[PDB]
Every structure is written in C-alpha cells, then in structure tokens.
Amino acid sequence: PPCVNPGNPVFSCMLDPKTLHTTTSLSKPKMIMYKT
Amino acid sequence: EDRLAKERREAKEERRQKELVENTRLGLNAQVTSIQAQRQAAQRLKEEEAL
Amino acid sequence: MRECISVHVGQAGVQIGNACWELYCLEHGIQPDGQMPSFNTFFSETGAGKHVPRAVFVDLEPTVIDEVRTGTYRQLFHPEQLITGKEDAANNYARGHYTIGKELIDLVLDRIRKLADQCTGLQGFLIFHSFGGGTGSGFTSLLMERLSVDYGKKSKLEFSIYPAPQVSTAVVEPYNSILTTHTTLEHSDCAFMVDNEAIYDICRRNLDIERPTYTNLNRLIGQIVSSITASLRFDGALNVDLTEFQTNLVPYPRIHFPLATYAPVISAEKAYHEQLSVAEITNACFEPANQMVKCDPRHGKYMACCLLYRGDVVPKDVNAAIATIKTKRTIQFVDWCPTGFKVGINYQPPTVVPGGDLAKVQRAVCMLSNTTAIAEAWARLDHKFDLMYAKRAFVHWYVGEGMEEGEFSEAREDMAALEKDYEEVGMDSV
Amino acid sequence: MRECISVHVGQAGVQIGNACWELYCLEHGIQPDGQMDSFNTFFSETGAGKHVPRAVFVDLEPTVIDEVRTGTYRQLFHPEQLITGKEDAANNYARGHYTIGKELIDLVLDRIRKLADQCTGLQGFLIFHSFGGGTGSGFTSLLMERLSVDYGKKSKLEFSIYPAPQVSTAVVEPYNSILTTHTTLEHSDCAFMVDNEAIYDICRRNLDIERPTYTNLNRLIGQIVSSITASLRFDGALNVDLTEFQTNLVPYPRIHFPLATYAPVISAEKAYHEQLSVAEITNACFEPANQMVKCDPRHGKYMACCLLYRGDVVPKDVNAAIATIKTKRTIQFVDWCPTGFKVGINYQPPTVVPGGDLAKVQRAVCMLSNTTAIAEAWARLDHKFDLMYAKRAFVHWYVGEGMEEGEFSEAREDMAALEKDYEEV
Amino acid sequence: MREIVHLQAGQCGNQIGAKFWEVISDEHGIDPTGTYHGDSDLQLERINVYYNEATGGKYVPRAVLVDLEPGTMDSVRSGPFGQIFRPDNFVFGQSGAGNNWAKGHYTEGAELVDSVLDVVRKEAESCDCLQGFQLTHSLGGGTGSGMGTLLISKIREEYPDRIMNTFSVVPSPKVSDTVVEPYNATLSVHQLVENTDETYCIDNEALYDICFRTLKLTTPTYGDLNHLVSATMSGVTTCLRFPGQLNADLRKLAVNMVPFPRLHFFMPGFAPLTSRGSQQYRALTVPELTQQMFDAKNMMAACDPRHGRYLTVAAVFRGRMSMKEVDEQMLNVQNKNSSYFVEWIPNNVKTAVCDIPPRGLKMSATFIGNSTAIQELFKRISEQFTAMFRRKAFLHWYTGEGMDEMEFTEAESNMNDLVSEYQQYQ
Amino acid sequence: MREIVHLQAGQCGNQIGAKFWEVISDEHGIDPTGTYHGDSDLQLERINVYYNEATGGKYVPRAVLVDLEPGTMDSVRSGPFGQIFRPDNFVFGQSGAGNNWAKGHYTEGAELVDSVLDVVRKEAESCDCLQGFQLTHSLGGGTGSGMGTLLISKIREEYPDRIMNTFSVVPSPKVSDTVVEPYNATLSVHQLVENTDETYCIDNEALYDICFRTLKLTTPTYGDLNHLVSATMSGVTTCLRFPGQLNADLRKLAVNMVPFPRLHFFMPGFAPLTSRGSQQYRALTVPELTQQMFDAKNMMAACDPRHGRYLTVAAVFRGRMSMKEVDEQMLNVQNKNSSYFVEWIPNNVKTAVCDIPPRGLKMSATFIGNSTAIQELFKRISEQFTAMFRRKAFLHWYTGEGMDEMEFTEAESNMNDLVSEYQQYQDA
Ligand SMILES: Nc1nc2c(ncn2[C@@H]2O[C@H](COP(=O)(O)OP(=O)(O)OP(=O)(O)O)[C@@H](O)[C@H]2O)c(=O)[nH]1
Ligand SMILES: Nc1nc2c(ncn2[C@@H]2O[C@H](COP(=O)(O)OP(=O)(O)OP(=O)(O)O)[C@@H](O)[C@H]2O)c(=O)[nH]1
Ligand SMILES: Nc1nc2c(ncn2[C@@H]2O[C@H](COP(=O)(O)OP(=O)(O)O)[C@@H](O)[C@H]2O)c(=O)[nH]1
Ligand SMILES: Nc1nc2c(ncn2[C@@H]2O[C@H](COP(=O)(O)OP(=O)(O)O)[C@@H](O)[C@H]2O)c(=O)[nH]1
Ligand SMILES: [Mg+2]
Ligand SMILES: [Mg+2]
C-alpha cells in the first residue's frame, strides 16, 4: 500500500493510481489524479 | 476507501488496548499468588514455634 | 554523551542506593554478576563485555558497606569505587566535617574525576543523604564545597531525608540539620525533601501493609528517583532532562527546597479495583492524606509544580486534566506566579521488583513542587534549636571536636533570616 | 453521561444498600468477580474490566461491614470505598456529628471527591437514612452540611427510614429523629418516607410469608427503588431522568416530607390466578389495606401523584385508568392544583430475584402521592417529645460529648414552624 | 430552487423526528443507507429541498433537532433510520434541563444556543436559495420548549423575512401528564405568538380518541399516534414535494390564511382514515368520503367548533381527481345551516389539488375547521394557571436562574389579551 | 529551479520536521530509502524545489537540523523516514539549554551557531536560484526559541532579501507547559517583529479543540497533531510546486496581504476535516469549503475573530474547480458578515488555485488570515509577563548569566506598542 501511515486524520489514498483513468473516443487514456 | 482505512485503524488500536488489559491482569495475578505463598509460610512458622 | 554520576553518602544514602541500583539493574536486563547477553547514561561499558554502573559509595563505617561486598551484587560493583572508613562520625557535624572527613576527602574526589573521564557530556550529579546524623550532615557538606570548586556549572541535584516533627531517632539531629543548612545553602543546586513519618503515614493507609522496614521504604525512594531520571534514556512525547528542574522550581537562590509525592502507591491486590487514568491521578497528589510531606499545603500556596508521567499517558488527556485543578478554590494560586506548571511524558511503563509492594500499573506520576507551607515546618526547628542552645546543652562535644562556639550563634542569624523570606513571598503585592 | 452515586447511611444504610445492590446485580449481568453501557449510571468501568459500584455507605458499628469484606460478594463490593471506624457511636448525634465523626469526614469526602473527579456527568446522589440510630443520623447530617458547600448544586435526595408510630428499636429515638429532621429540613432536596412497621403489616397480611425478616423488607425496598429510579438505565416510551424528580416533586422549600403507596404486592400463588391489568389494579394504590407508611389520605387531601410504570403499559389504558380514578370523588383536590399527575413509562419489566415470593408480573403499577396526612404523624411525635423533654432524659451523654444544651431547643421550635407550614392549607 | 432546513424540538421532538421523517423519506424512496431506490420520475424531482448532495450521491436530511440530556439521542438512533440522520446536528449537552424552562433558556440553553446557531447558519449558506422552516414541539418539557423557543426568539430578528411556521404540541385537558406545564406551555405562547407565523393544536387526547373509536386498534402506542401526525402535516407541504394541478406550497399557505397577523392559532383536523373492518365497505369517492369529514368525532384537536365559528377553513387534496364534485360536495354543506356557517364571512375556500397520492392509497382529502373554541382551550387554562400563581407553586426554583416575578404576570397578561382578541369576532 | 531551504529548531522543531518530510515525500512518491517510484512525471518535473539529487537517483532532502539535546535528535534518525536526511546535516548539541532563552541566545546558543551557519552556506552555494527559508520552532523552550532567534538575527546579514517564514507554536492560553515560559515568549517576539517577513501562530490547545470537536479522535498523540499542522505548511508553498490556473507563490502571498511591515502575525487553518461518522454523510462542493475555513471553530490559533476585525485574508485552492464558483462564493462571505471586515480596504480576499489536489481528494484549501483577534492573545502574555517581572520572580536564572533587566523592559516596549498598533488599526 502506498501510504505514509494508513488512517491519518487529513485525507489519504490506497488505490493503485495506475488504474484510475477514463478515455474519450477522440483522446488517449489520461489519469484523473493529475489532469491539469 | 479512506473511510474504511480509518475504521480499521481504530479497530487495530482497540486490539492493542485489550492486549494492555490482559497483561495488567497477568502481572497482578502473579503478584497476588506470591503474596499468598508468603502468608502460608508465616503460618508454617507459627506451627513450628508452638511445637 | 549524557553520563550522570550518583554518589551516596552516609548509611541512609547507601541503603537507598542498595535498593536504587536494584531498580536500575532490572529496567535494563542486567544479571547481578553484571553481564548482558542507550544505557550508557548510567552504566559504563568495559572492554570485556561487562557493564559497571557509574557511582561512588562513601561511608564512615565498615559495618554497613561489607554487606554490599558480600551480597548478591558484589561483582557488578567496581572493587574500588566503594569507599570505606575506620572511625565513625557518631552523629556529630563537628566530627563528620572537621575530624574524620578531612582524612577521607582526598580519595573520593580522586575517583570521581576519573569516573567523569569516561564521559564526554556530563550534566548532573546525585548526592543521597539524610539530615539526621553526622556523615549525612558533616561529610555531605564537606564535599559540596569540593565539587563546587572543581566543576561549578554542573547541576548537582540531591535527595534529603528530613527530620520529621513527631518522630525522631537522635537528639542531636536538630543541630545537624541547621548546622548543615548554612554550608549546604550556598553550595547546592536543588534539594529534594521526603521525611520518614509521611512515608510512614502513607504506607499504613493506602497500602494494606502495616509494620514496615526501610527495605519497603527504599523501594519507594528508589522508585521516586527512577521516575525522575527515566526521561533521559527512554524516548517519550514530552521528555524533560535532569538539568531542567533547576530553573522551574527555584525562583530565588535562598529558596531551593522542592518536595516530592508519587501518586499510584496502591497495593498489588488493590491495583485490581480502580481504573488508573491520568485524570484520576493528577489530583491524587494534592490530597492531604497522600503527600509524602507532613506539611499540609492548604496552609500555604503552591509555588510551582513539575509533573512527570510514565507509560501509556496521552497528551490530550493530560491537558484537560491539568486545566481543571486550578479552576477549583481548594487548590491555590495567586498573582505573582500564575502559570506554575510543566509536564513530562514517558513511554516506559514502570517495572516491578520481586518483593516490592508496588504494582505494574501503566500510568504513574511523580509530583515535584515547593509550597509556602515549608515555613511552618522550620518554625518548629529554629525553635527546637533554641530550647537546646539557651543552656548550651549539647555543644560540649562540638567545641572539643575542632570547631569553636562562634558558628552556633552565626547559625541563628542565617537561619532566622530564611523564615522572614517566606513571609515576604506569601504576602500579596499591591 | 448520567453517572450516579447512591450513598446509603446507617446499619439500614448498609443492609438496604446491599439488598438493593443485589437486585441491581441480578437485573444486570453481574458475576461477583465483576466481569459480566446502559449500566454506566451506577457502575464504573476499570482498566481491568471490573464494573465497580459507585456507592460508599456509612456505618460506625464496625460489626456490619466486618462481614462484607467476606461472604459471597467480597470481590464484588470494593471495601476501600466502604468506610467503618474502630469506635462506635451508640445512639448519639454528638458522637456521630463531631466527636467520632470529626475524623472520618476527611476520608469520606475525599473519596467522594476522588470518584466524582474520575466521573464526568453527575447530577446528584441518592440517600436513605434511618432516623433512629447513632451514625445513620449524625454523620449523615455532617455529610449533607459539608457536601452542600463542597459541591453545592449537585442534588441530594433522601427517602428515609422513619420511626413507627408504636413499635421501635432504641429508647429515645425521637431525640435523634428531631436532631436530624432539623437538618433534613435544611439540606435535603427531597425526603420521602418508608418504614418497617407498615411493611410488616402488608407482607404479613397479603403474602403468605409469615415470620419475615428485614432481609425481606430490604427486598421490597429494592422493588420500590427500582421502580422509582429505573429509567436512567432502561429506555422508555415517556421516560424520566433524576433531575425531573426534584423539579416536579415538591411544592414548597420547607415542605418535602410527604408519602406514597406501592400497590402490586401479590404472591406467585395469587398471581397464577389474578390478572393484573394496568387499569384494574392501579386503584390499589388508594385502597386502605395497601399503603407504605401508616397514614390514611382518606383523612387527608391528595396533593400530587407521581405514577411510575413498567412492562406492558399502554398509553390508552393508563389514560383510561387515570380517568376512572379521577371520576370517583374520594379524590379531594382543592383549587391550588386540580390537574396533579405525572406519568413515567418504562419498557424493561422488573426482575425476579430468588428469595422473594413476588413472581414475574408482565406489567406494573407504582405511586408517589404527595399527601396532607403527615400532620397527625408529626403532631403525635410533637406530643411524645413534649412528654419526654419536660424532665431531660438522656441529655448528659450528649452534653458531655461536646456541645451545649441549647442545641435541643434550637432544633425544636423549628418543628412547630414546620407543622405551621403544614397546617397552612 | 427553494430548499428547506428543519426544526423539531425535544426528545418528543426527537420522537416526532422519528415517525414524521418516516413518511417523507419513504415516499421519495431513500433506503436507510442513503442511495436512491425509487421507481418513478417524480421521485427525483426536487429532493434537494430536504436532502443535501453528499459525495457518492447520498441524500442527507438537512435538519436540526434539539435536546440537552444525553440519553435521548440514542433511543431515536435505535430506529431503522439512525444512519440517514447524520447526528452531527442532533444536539445535546452534558447537563439536561429536566422539566425546567429557565434551565434550558438562560443557564446552559443560552450557552448552547451559540452552538445550534453556528450550524443552522453554516448550512443555510450552502443553500443557494432557502425557503424557510417548519416546526412541531412539545411544551411540557424543559429543553424542547426552552431551547426551542430560544431558537425562534434568536432567529426572528436575524432572519425576519423568511417564513417559519409551527404546529406545536399542547396537551390534554382532563388527563395531563406533567402538570406544572402552564409554567412551561403558557410562558412560551407569549414568546411564540409574537415570533411565529402559524401554530396549531395537536392534542394527545384527540390522537387517543381515534384508536378508541375510528381505527379500532385495541392497544395503541404513541408511535401510531405519531403515525397520524405525519399523515396530516404531509398535507401542508404537499406541493413542494408533488407537482400539482392547482398547487399551494409553503408561501401560499403563508399568505392566504392570516387575516390579523397576531391570530394564527387554529384547529387542525383530518377527514379520511377508517378501520380495517370498514376497509371492505368503503369507496375511494368524494360523497362516501364526505360522511366521515365534518363529524364531531374525527378531528386532530379535542375542541369542538359547535361552540365556535368558521373563520379560515382550508382543504388540500391528493390525486388526479374530479374537480367539479370537489366543488359540488363542498357546497352541499355550506348550504345547510346558519349557526356554524357564519354569514359574515362571504365565502372562504382554499383549494389545492396534487397529482401523485401518498404511497399505499389512491385518493384522500384534508381539512381544517376554524373556531372560537381554541379560545376555550385557553379559557380553561385561565383558571388553572391562576390557581398556582396565587400560591407560589414551584417559583422558588425559577427565581434562582435570573428572572423576574412580573414575567409570569406579563405573560399571563398577554394570554388574557389574546383570549380577549378572539372574543371580538365572537 | 527556485527552491526553499528547510531548517528546523528544537525538540518541537525536529518532531514537526520529521512529520513534514514524512508527508511531502510520498505526495512526490518517494520510497523510505530515497528513490522516486511514483506514477506520473508531473510530480517529477519540479521535484528540485524541496529535494536534492545525487548519484544514481538517490534523492536527499535538503533540510538543516539543529537541536541541543542529543537524546531526542536520535529519535528521528530511528523513525521510518530517518534514513533520507544526510547525516552530515545533523548538528547536535553536547549539553541541553535548560529552557532559559538567553542560554539559547548567549551562553550555549553562540557555541554551535558557527557550525549551523557552516552547513547552510555550503548548501546555499549549491542552490541554483534560492527563493526562501522555512523554519519551525516552539516559543516555549530555550532549545527551540533561543536557538532560532540567534539564527534569524544574523541570517539577515547574509541573505537580506530572501523571503523568510517561521511557523511558531505560540503558548496556549489555558495552560502553558513551562513555568518560566513567558520570559522566553516575550523575549522571542522582539527578534520576531523586526527580522521575519512572515510568521504564523499555531495554538497548541486550538489543535486540541479540533480533536475535541471536529475530528473527535479518541486518543490523539503528537504524531496525530503534527500531521494536522504539516498539511497546512504544505499548502502554502504549493503553487510553485505544481502548475495552476491562477498561481501564487510565497512572494505573492506576502506583498498582497500584510499592510504594514511590523504587522505580519498570521493565523492559519486547513479546510477539509471530517470525522469517521460524518465522512459517509458529508457534501463535497465548493461552498462546503467556505463553511470550514471561515468557521472560527476551525482555526488553529485560539482567539475567535468575532472580538476583532480582519484586515486581509488568504485562500489557496488546491484542486480542479470552476473559477467563477470560488469568486462568487467569496463575496457572499463578505456581505452577510461585513462587521468583521474593515472599511479602508475595498476587497479583502486573496484568490489562488492550483490544479493538482492532495493525493486522492477532489478539492482542498488553506486559509491564512491576518486578524486583530490576536491582540486579545497578545494582551494576555503582556499581563502574564508583568506578574513575574515586578516581584522579580525567577530573575536570577537570566540576570546573572546574560543581559541585565533593561532587556525585559525593552521587550515590554517592543510588545506594548504592537498591541497599541493592532488597536489603532481595529477601527482606523
Ligand atoms: N528512607 C530511609 N531512611 C533511612 C534509612 N536508613 C537510615 N535512615 C534515616 O537515617 C537517619 C539516621 O541517620 P543515619 O543515616 O542512620 O546516620 P548517618 O547519616 O549515616 O551517620 P552515621 O551513621 O554516624 O554514619 C534516621 O532518622 C533514618 O530515618 C533508609 O534505609 N531509608
Ligand atoms: N428495614 C430495615 N431496617 C434496618 C435494617 N438494618 C437496620 N435497620 C434500622 O436500623 C434501626 C436500628 O439500627 P441502628 O441503631 O439505627 O444502627 P445504625 O445507626 O443504622 O448504624 P450503627 O449504629 O453504626 O449500627 C432499626 O430501627 C431499623 O429500622 C434493615 O436491614 N432493614
Ligand atoms: N402527541 C404526542 N405527544 C407526545 C409524544 N411524545 C411525548 N408526548 C407528550 O410530551 C409530554 C412529555 O414531554 P417531555 O418529555 O416532558 O418533553 P421533552 O423533554 O421535550 O421530550 C407527555 O405529556 C406526552 O403526552 C408524541 O409522539 N406525540
Ligand atoms: N505541535 C507539537 N508540539 C510539541 C511536540 N512535542 C513537543 N511539543 C511542544 O514543545 C513544548 C516543550 O518542548 P520544548 O523542548 O520546551 O520546546 P523546544 O525548545 O522548541 O524544543 C511543549 O509545550 C509542547 O507543546 C509535537 O510533536 N508537536
Ligand atoms: Mg554511622
Ligand atoms: Mg450496621
């Protein structure tokens, strides 16, 4: 798990970040945590 | 998911607290059994003095 | 890098130290031969895989020190760091400072220079003595001159056993407390004070035990010194080193007598019955029954208090517990010193020794404070010194033992000016 | 959040304390080693799992808590809390209040301060005292008078053991009765009455337990204290906390010594026959062969009615019952409060303890009717204290143990004012 | 785009805040864990009126309910819906009031009204456009009357323009279960009548009387009495939840039944609801409905307008219905008498029709019949409060928390004023 | 390419920094031994702002650590992330301070200050184009307050125009955790009001109020409290760490929100904070953040701003959000509460958005508010200081080893003017 310490008071994440993405018919798959 | 992470961390800390309670029980039970042993030794010496 | 040297003087200093090192050799897993199959603050590593504690035992009588060298600890201790004598002081400051101690000072200082040569970063001493007898007044005052001319800025913190009001052992103890309070006022950096009769008054009531001996008492006094020094080696959230206590409890150099009280002294049978949180235990040291002082501080006012905690104590539950205790009208502060408090938290739970009447409860606090109420304790003692000196009752040995009669009248003016200094403090400033 | 301390004082204080704690200790799952949070009003969790009761008692004849160190519940009741001396008081307000009571007040108040400093959400204390003893009167009075300035506005209630009109235990029991009614007129928030002679009459006549004991009497006191203060742990359709009692119970500040009744005392052999419906048995809090301390409110005037209920209680049936009680004109409500009632409803039905004969009933009935017929009782007690303080019966022991003789006649002439306050209506 | 923040006051308010929030949360189809489970299109119309939009799409009732004693938040959390009311807003203190209006108003009621007004102004900023509030509350209690009136005193000056109705809970005449409540219920109506926009009479005796004579439940509860109050007050907020043919939402009821602005105490009632033995022999039609409508034994308060006079009478309706026989069967009872049918009022009819019915039934109605017998409610109290004010009943508790002796005379002096204000049209 | 040099001070300073580098690392995605293994390269394109590079991709945090007591300096070397700071930078003290401030300033403060300056100029030479300095300390101790005041006094000789922040721990108003604390605290601020271009204020009991009320954590230790404040000190220095739609670094936050150069005492708070109960429940849109930051309850310095008025406020918005929504929802905090906002400034709020949120969240935000509420704080210590000076309580621990009694009275005049400075601008 990619956590500093699980269940710290301010927010944390445990999903594998390589899998959260969604593409369009006219674009490549881009990751949603780092879309600017 | 972070909801679940907080809930399971609280459960882990509760487990450690119950461990602490059991080891306090361990120490106090050992101490009181040794205390009973010295009490019985005192009664033995009282019998020997009587004889 | 944080080596501290404990030196024990007198019978009461060394009999405390016999039970003191028993605690320190068990919180570190040390066999009493000395081996071990961050401890360098109190122990010294040799080249042979062997630990030796950094300490010096000094006494003027062989009859108390020979049981140390044929006991169950005779090989853990260094063969030379235990120091002896041949002619007893016999309860006399004139004999413990002018006759005997002048022939046994040149070697005790010789060793403690070498026992500080193992170190690089020394910050504290610990002198253990009692204010009842000769070597515990005469010899302990002689060295405080000698450590001061050699070291200076090293903060030497002490432990003292006061002569209680009601009970006593000697009849020349009220001389020897005042006659050392002159010399040990300029040359001491703190002074911890716990009397016998308020360990006696506690030990009857909160513990089930009645009729004790000093081996049960020194398991408390050994525990109170280990509760102070535990923050040096065990990591905690709020650690307080030994050199900190000087600037927080001594407002004025004339007033350096704080007091001690250790809260959860409950029976191992009666450790079962009460929850021991931190909010239950920061109030219990202020209970009039539970102090180790036979001066009720309700007669006075709390100057400054330092608190130190051990084991599973959390800093959220101690800030809420300490704010309540000054909201009540029972516990008294006034304007000129309104903060008063500092805390100490440690992660080492207090251990138990076999035969100890304590229990392995995980939240233990020692209370470290000075009050206004000590001034009425001396108000007996300067008075009791004057019932004897009004017909010069027991100075007749003292004049023949190397000091003149001139220091006794000087002991009046120095001690009587101390009593007026307390009532300067207690009167409100408007 | 609503933690309580129930301090019961006297030899009555200790024995009613442990039988009421017996019925508590069986209605929740207490095994006498403490191991098993609705209990948490009366119990205290430890760091070792133990549920220690929050209840110190007062008894100075040490021969009563020289038992409770042993027995069945030796590890259950914690005896560092239960406090006894080594020199008894023996029918003496002087010894109880300031002579032998001068030195344990430190320990008792220090312990109460330490427990209520451990706690967070107190509201007040429950108190039962016996009028006619040595320490159940005097050190009790010292407890009230010193706690009223140590804490102040935390409540203290009392539902006192009072002398019977005819048969009594000590000889001169009215002296200590008056010397505690002057102080419970001052520092008691509430004070009802329950005495042993009326329990004798009721348990003798209806249940078939002839030859009873104070233990059986203690059991019935446990049943009434459960059906009074049962709602801090057991939820209800229309419940009640402790503070509502002091808020709604008593009209005047100097008038808080009225009565009650408890109807359903029916055996198992009569309970297998009689149906016990909330309508048709709640009228037995008014029938003359049932009452709780020996006085008849048919002679008097009904003042107020704190009804308390447990079990299979219906709001429709309690309202029809209250209606058909308020119909028949034995109800004498003069204009000052026509409405009167207070209703408490509790889900959890009362608990069978082995040792009584009152079987498990499916639903219950209570009463606390404030009354007006206390006046003849206190006036009879006036009559016989005047019979006894014309010739100064036992005064020398009280005087020589450390007071003046004006204490007696300053405690009296308050009581004539008390019955003037009671004869005002 | 109006949305609602709510107010129900007491443990009785928390008890009403159990079953009142049953019927509304049932009909817009939300499970006891939040996510949508309805089966139509009207059931996702405007359900941001009561419910916020959480993360994950979860719908939380924007409501505040008040108590101070800590043991009353859990027996409403033992219900099935304890995970849909977020209990952040369900407030309680360390010390409770306990039948004491002064304790919950000045002592810590004033100390914790800072807390409840730091959250009701916190969520009303998130609302883009509010609508108002809506209340029921018991009176004979301490916090629900006390902090409840402290709410509606500390809000009619900060937010005076918004509309905040009430329908309070005053208790029965002949059997009354906490009887020093004229210190609690008649103090508050002096506070209430210059604050609120409406207040009606939900009498427990009238709720008791239905399961006696009408629904034939042998052994009822308050819970099935609390059933009958969300079966009525749903009809007052029927149009912001259901689209209509001729709709009357919260403000139209706020503007069309207030003639004289101090006079908003009327007598609510409920016409249709009969037993399960009378379920076989009953149609869903207006003329068979009209027999069980105007009787002297079917209402929601226990005061009869046979003594009284019909001033402001309303009728909201459910169902896609024949809307000339609404008008035909309402004029066959305005054309029958001249004792109750006051000729001075020319005609007062307030008609609303809504399409989608309550869940489980097809047609219904609702009614209110106004009277001068809400005057005779307070006429009786005007010789029950005077009984225990001349003789100083519990007042020695009351002066200890910072109040006057004349405040009880002055609130009684307003009570004799408004009773005198009802008799001018009588 | 422009970067910040971290530097800590004291046992409280070291324990903060051990959980500041614990939370900046795996937001950049760094293993416990110092090799980048994160997912996207967008966190890699300006990793040099808080990090430094070495042979074979082994990254080195560039923080300069000083402490006088070596018994707690080793506590962070034995932590999980203790093996990434290069052990040349550990500057230990051989003996402790003793909580007297002038020991940390004159006697045993001046002994180490040659060495601590040796590692920063060695590091600052290796910097490319340095921007600012970052400091954490507590006011309450001679290890933290005394050491830092000697560092910041003569770092303005060498680096005058470098933008310095210090993140103090002001003593709590209810219980201050040292007896002779306010001598140290009042003497610290005189080196603070002239040197530091910005300073922050973290009350220790206001963070206790958060675990009392908002989070309602059962058992919060200092590991939990340091994590709650370390997120706040990451939000400030972020718009130069990631791209954004309207960015604002440290210089733009400073010159846009202090009005006068000796009026810079700040008051921070961090917006999205939710308990485990309410987290299933809670709304997440942009006005739900304006509830959090402008709640006076969620404010990690003790004084409520209802007793005073704001001058300028700051609000950086880490997230991918609509610009109008922020701008529309900032006037609607000014309008309904216009009595807590002064009149000779037209608009008060400062706007900043950064696209990349904290790792996982949708949006997050940080509030920094310059208030006149803090004079109600600063009036407290000045009264608290006079109660121990007039009767000369605990005097000789400072007089006989350092400066004389004038420095106390000078520090009164440096303190009394500021409280009069706040009040004069409270109603202009
Ligand atoms: N707490 C404690 N006090 C002790 C102990 N042993 C002796 N004392 C105290 O010491 C006092 C008497 O002084 P001592 O220490 O025995 O005599 P001394 O100071 O060694 O002087 P000399 O015996 O002549 O060398 C008595 O009042 C005791 O209270 C001990 O083991 N523990
Ligand atoms: N009903 C009841 N009354 C009791 C019980 N135990 C004692 N009493 C009452 O106590 C009275 C005699 O006991 P006391 O002389 O009062 O003893 P005490 O004052 O309570 O306490 P001590 O004098 O210290 O023993 C009798 O009149 C009883 O009414 C009991 O178990 N049940
Ligand atoms: N109509 C109705 N009355 C109720 C309900 N719950 C309680 N009551 C009435 O409220 C009165 C008691 O209220 P109380 O507990 O003192 O007020 P609270 O503390 O605010 O809940 C009783 O007389 C009941 O008749 C309910 O659900 N419906
Ligand atoms: N925020 C925070 N404060 C701490 C921590 N540890 C200690 N402190 C504070 O530090 C103070 C005592 O530490 P001290 O050594 O005197 O401070 P220093 O000289 O700056 O290191 C106490 O008042 C605590 O509030 C921590 O982990 N976090
Ligand atoms: Mg000797
Ligand atoms: Mg007894």
XYZ file of N, CA and C in Angstrom, chain F residues 55-118:
192
model
N 23.967 10.662 -6.748
C 24.377 9.615 -7.677
C 23.348 8.502 -7.768
N 22.978 8.157 -8.997
C 22.071 7.053 -9.215
C 20.654 7.294 -8.771
N 20.189 8.537 -8.809
C 18.813 8.824 -8.471
C 18.495 8.775 -6.999
N 19.503 8.697 -6.140
C 19.268 8.672 -4.704
C 19.021 10.099 -4.244
N 17.781 10.401 -3.874
C 17.392 11.760 -3.525
C 17.688 12.073 -2.065
N 18.053 13.323 -1.805
C 18.437 13.785 -0.480
C 17.568 14.982 -0.118
N 16.756 14.899 0.937
C 16.125 16.102 1.486
C 17.163 17.072 2.022
N 16.918 18.353 1.785
C 17.911 19.404 1.965
C 17.705 20.178 3.254
N 17.110 19.542 4.253
C 16.787 20.215 5.498
C 17.993 20.261 6.418
N 18.098 21.357 7.157
C 19.194 21.601 8.081
C 18.637 21.466 9.484
N 19.112 20.480 10.225
C 18.518 20.142 11.507
C 19.476 20.513 12.624
N 18.978 21.242 13.617
C 19.752 21.577 14.803
C 18.908 21.292 16.036
N 19.547 20.726 17.057
C 18.934 20.539 18.359
C 20.044 20.408 19.388
N 19.772 20.871 20.604
C 20.787 20.857 21.647
C 20.791 19.580 22.474
N 19.673 18.865 22.562
C 19.659 17.640 23.345
C 19.756 16.420 22.437
N 20.861 15.671 22.463
C 21.020 14.569 21.503
C 20.145 13.362 21.793
N 19.464 13.321 22.936
C 18.583 12.215 23.250
C 17.295 12.171 22.464
N 16.850 13.303 21.916
C 15.689 13.329 21.039
C 16.045 13.627 19.593
N 17.306 13.941 19.308
C 17.728 14.067 17.922
C 17.841 12.694 17.273
N 18.228 11.685 18.050
C 18.296 10.318 17.562
C 16.929 9.675 17.415
N 15.881 10.280 17.970
C 14.545 9.711 17.847
C 14.012 9.817 16.428
N 14.431 10.841 15.677
C 14.019 10.961 14.283
C 14.966 10.251 13.332
N 16.162 9.869 13.784
C 17.003 9.034 12.944
C 16.521 7.591 12.976
N 15.858 7.194 14.055
C 15.301 5.857 14.182
C 13.865 5.761 13.687
N 13.303 6.840 13.150
C 11.975 6.804 12.585
C 11.955 6.101 11.244
N 10.755 5.878 10.695
C 10.658 5.260 9.364
C 11.367 6.017 8.254
N 11.279 7.344 8.227
C 11.964 8.135 7.214
C 13.230 8.785 7.749
N 13.930 8.121 8.654
C 15.116 8.719 9.223
C 16.344 8.554 8.361
N 16.272 7.675 7.366
C 17.438 7.329 6.570
C 17.520 8.097 5.260
N 16.826 9.221 5.136
C 16.933 10.029 3.933
C 17.657 11.346 4.162
N 17.632 11.902 5.372
C 18.448 13.075 5.654
C 19.907 12.662 5.737
N 20.770 13.390 5.042
C 22.188 13.056 5.060
C 22.774 13.389 6.427
N 23.489 12.459 7.073
C 23.900 12.677 8.466
C 25.058 13.643 8.661
N 25.476 14.353 7.614
C 26.348 15.494 7.842
C 25.570 16.666 8.415
N 24.281 16.754 8.082
C 23.445 17.895 8.421
C 22.892 17.846 9.833
N 23.096 16.758 10.562
C 22.650 16.696 11.948
C 23.638 17.494 12.777
N 23.183 18.590 13.364
C 24.035 19.394 14.226
C 23.549 19.215 15.656
N 24.194 18.325 16.398
C 23.785 18.028 17.757
C 24.459 18.985 18.727
N 23.837 19.155 19.886
C 24.433 19.891 20.986
C 24.908 18.907 22.039
N 26.024 19.234 22.683
C 26.563 18.284 23.641
C 25.851 18.386 24.984
N 25.353 19.569 25.331
C 24.562 19.759 26.536
C 23.303 20.548 26.202
N 22.264 20.331 27.002
C 20.988 20.972 26.776
C 20.980 22.427 27.196
N 19.892 23.106 26.839
C 19.748 24.526 27.132
C 19.257 24.787 28.549
N 18.262 24.040 29.013
C 17.658 24.315 30.301
C 16.496 25.280 30.267
N 15.906 25.511 29.092
C 14.681 26.273 28.839
C 14.768 27.754 29.195
N 15.902 28.236 29.679
C 16.159 29.662 29.711
C 16.583 30.138 28.329
N 15.957 31.225 27.882
C 16.089 31.656 26.496
C 17.470 32.221 26.202
N 18.063 32.939 27.156
C 19.352 33.571 26.904
C 20.504 32.576 26.887
N 20.341 31.414 27.520
C 21.272 30.314 27.295
C 21.245 29.881 25.840
N 20.052 29.825 25.252
C 19.916 29.584 23.831
C 20.310 30.756 22.965
N 20.514 31.928 23.555
C 20.896 33.101 22.790
C 22.322 33.567 23.049
N 22.844 33.405 24.267
C 24.180 33.905 24.583
C 25.163 32.798 24.939
N 24.879 31.987 25.961
C 25.937 31.165 26.541
C 26.165 29.882 25.755
N 25.168 29.004 25.686
C 25.286 27.797 24.880
C 24.518 27.878 23.573
N 23.993 29.050 23.223
C 23.478 29.237 21.880
C 24.559 29.657 20.906
N 25.482 30.509 21.355
C 26.538 31.019 20.489
C 27.637 30.004 20.230
N 27.653 28.885 20.953
C 28.721 27.917 20.757
C 28.525 27.104 19.485
N 27.285 26.765 19.143
C 27.015 25.946 17.970
C 26.728 26.750 16.715
N 26.543 28.067 16.827
C 25.989 28.831 15.715
C 27.016 29.027 14.602
N 28.297 28.801 14.887
C 29.285 28.756 13.818
C 29.087 27.528 12.942
N 28.727 26.398 13.551
C 28.582 25.157 12.801
C 27.293 25.124 11.993
N 26.200 25.655 12.546
C 24.920 25.636 11.846
C 24.964 26.568 10.647
N 25.678 27.685 10.766
C 25.917 28.515 9.597
C 26.855 27.862 8.594
N 27.668 26.891 9.012
C 28.609 26.281 8.081
C 27.871 25.403 7.073
